[PDB]
Each structure stands twice: as C-alpha cells, then as structure tokens.
Structure 1
Amino acid sequence: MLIPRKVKHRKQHHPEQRGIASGGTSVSFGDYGIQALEHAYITNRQIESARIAINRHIKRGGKVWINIFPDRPLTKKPAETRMGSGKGSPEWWVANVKPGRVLFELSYPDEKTARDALTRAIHKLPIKARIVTREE
C-alpha cells in the first residue's frame, strides 16, 4: 500500500475534482502507459491491485511506474452514529485524478503482452482509461 509517511494536516477537504489534468499528461518513463479519461479518487487499494495485475501478466521483466501517489486522506465517521460531533478520523488514502493524467506507465519489449497487461490494470480502476504510446 502507498501511504505518506506524514501529512502536515490529516483532515483536509475533499479534493476539487473538476477540470482537465494540466500537469502530468505525457508518457515519459516507460514506452506504454495508461492515461485517464474521468475524474476520480484512485485509492491505494486500486493502485495496488492494478500494479499486481500488471506484474502478474508480464511476470518476467519490465518496469512499472506508478506516477500518481495516494497522499490525500478521506475520512469516515464511525458507523451507526448521527450527524455532528465533529469530523471523523481519516481511514483511506486517495490520489485525485483528472481526465488527462497518465496513471501507470510500463516498459516492456513486445507490444501485445504490454497492451494486455495495461488493460488488465485498467479493469481494476474506477474510471475509463486508454493505452497511450510514447509517440504522438
């Protein structure tokens, strides 16, 4: 799981989830990547599942870059409780994703296996994404 070692403030507001990804929209580390198309909260659960999916599919040798970090905490007040008594305790972690941001990036020799591992990862995410290549 990806968890920040510390955050200055542990109870923030929900990340504003509007607009198009301005920063981080290109594939730079590896040759193939997964590039997003919808706003969402990608938790570290989703990221871990997707990374393990890619590693299971390729399983030999190739680099997976998770160039998004879940470092924004969503809190949840304990069950069966009414409204009030202050904000809850943080208990899951999130990356704020805009349409445009390359989420995962992969470097691997062949084409079809790389594409299939990337779509295997895509299926684990709460959004629509597409496979994007290192060239325009």
Structure 2
Amino acid sequence: MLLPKRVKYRREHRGKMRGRAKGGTEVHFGEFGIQALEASWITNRQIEAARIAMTRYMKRGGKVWIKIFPSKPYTAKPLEVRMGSGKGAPEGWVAVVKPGKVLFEISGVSEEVAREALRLASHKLPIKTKFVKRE
C-alpha cells in the first residue's frame, strides 16, 4: 500500500480529468512500458495487485520503474447518513491518470514475458491501455 507518510492537508477538493498526460508518457528509465488510453482514480492496492501478478508470472521480474504515487486522498463518510455536517473522513489514497501516461516500465526480462505479464496485469484493471517500448 503506497503511501505518503506526511501530508499538508488530509483532505482536498476532489479534482477533474481533462486533457492529457503532461509527462512520463514514454518508457525511458526501463525498456518495455504500458500506457494509458483513458484516465481514472486508482488505488495502491490495485497497482500492487498488478505488482504481485507480474512478479509471480516472472517470479522476480527484472525491474520496473513505476511512474506514479497515490498522492491524492479521498474521503468516505459513514453509512446511512444525510448530507452536510462537514466533509467526510479520509479513507485511503488515490492515484490519478491522464491518457497517454505510462504507468510501469519494465526491463531485464524478455519482451514476450513482458507482453504476457502485462496482459495479466491489465486484465485486473478498469481501463484501456496498451503495451509500449523504448525508441
């Protein structure tokens, strides 16, 4: 469960997703990447689920260069409650996206292994993506 250990404000305004990825849209710390075609709000539990998936398919698989960090928190009020009475309480964390953004690079392991590992990684996920590699 990726975390920021320290925060300024426990809470935020929620945010939006328009446009496209500023940077990190291409594999250059690793060899064989995966990138977005969409965007959403994402959990460290999900990304580490993919981690364990790929690293068990590969069993130590190479090296990654993860591109992201779940900086954003989100709240979740208690249950069967009405509106108002102040903002809800912080619940977990969130990792945000823009399309064209790369999430995981890979290196040290064969391209075909990469393809299938990231297949099993991708099928976890709510989004549409594709494989990439370095220029």
Q: Could you say whether these structures have the same fold, taking a TM-score greater than 0.5 normalized by the shorter chain as the test?
A: yes
2:82 alignment counterpart: 82
Aligned residues: 135
- Given residue 13 of structure 1, which amino acid in structure 2 is its aligned partner? H
- Equivalent residues in 2 for 1:6-85 (5 A)? 6-85=6-85
Instruction: Check whether the contact 1:72–1:93 (CA below 8 A) recurs between aligned residues.
Output: yes
Distance in 2 (alpha carbons) for counterparts of 1:59 and 1:30: 18
Deviations for 1:49-93, whole angstroms, at most 9, x for unmatched residues?
A: 111111011114400222111110010101111111010111121
Sequence identity percentage: 64
Superposed displacement of residue 44, structure 1:
0.8
Distance in 2 (alpha carbons) for counterparts of 1:125 and 1:14: 22
Instruction: Check whether the contact 1:42–1:126 (CA below 8 A) recurs between aligned residues.
Output: no
- Given residue 129 of structure 2, which amino acid in structure 1 is its aligned partner? A
TM-score (norm 2): 0.94
2:94 alignment counterpart: 94
- Given residue 22 of structure 1, which amino acid in structure 2 is its aligned partner? K
RMSD (CA atoms): 1.1
4+ residue segments displaced more than 3 Å: none
1:3 alignment counterpart: 3
SS at match of 2:15: coil
